[PDB]
Amino acid sequence: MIRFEIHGDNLTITDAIRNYIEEKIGKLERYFNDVPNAVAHVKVKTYSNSATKIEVTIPLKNVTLRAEERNDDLYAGIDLINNKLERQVRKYKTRINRKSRDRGDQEVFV
Numbered sequence: 001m002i003r004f005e006i007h008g009d010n011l012t013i014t015d016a017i018r019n020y021i022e023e024k025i026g027k028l029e030r031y032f033n034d035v036p037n038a039v040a041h042v043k044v045k046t047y048s049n050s051a052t053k054i055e056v057t058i059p060l061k062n063v064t065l066r067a068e069e070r071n072d073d074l075y076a077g078i079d080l081i082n083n084k085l086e087r088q089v090r091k092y093k094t095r096i097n098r099k100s101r102d103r104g105d106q107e108v109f110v
């Protein structure tokens with residue numbers, strides 16, 4: 001089961017975001033079906049609507065994304081990681097997939 005293990009010390013510490021993330025991570029992992037385990041170890045930290053300090057660490061099978069930054073929007077921090085998730089997830093899975101066919105991406109053929 002795809003898990004979300006957040007420690008969020010922010011203003012809105014309720015089911016709202018947890019659900020919000022459940023939707024996000026849910027919709028992300030529902031892009032896959034062969035994903036038994038994907039996690040979101042996230043930690044936001046703010047006592048101001050004009051603040052957010054976040055740190056995501058989302059261990060999928062393939063890759064674990066971590067994003068640790070102080071940025072006004074939480075959702076931008078997690079978007080940093082989510083959007084980079086798309087970016088990195090695809091970079092990683094597509095690279096590790098193509099390593100069979102693409103022999104000379106890291107190799108100069110010595």
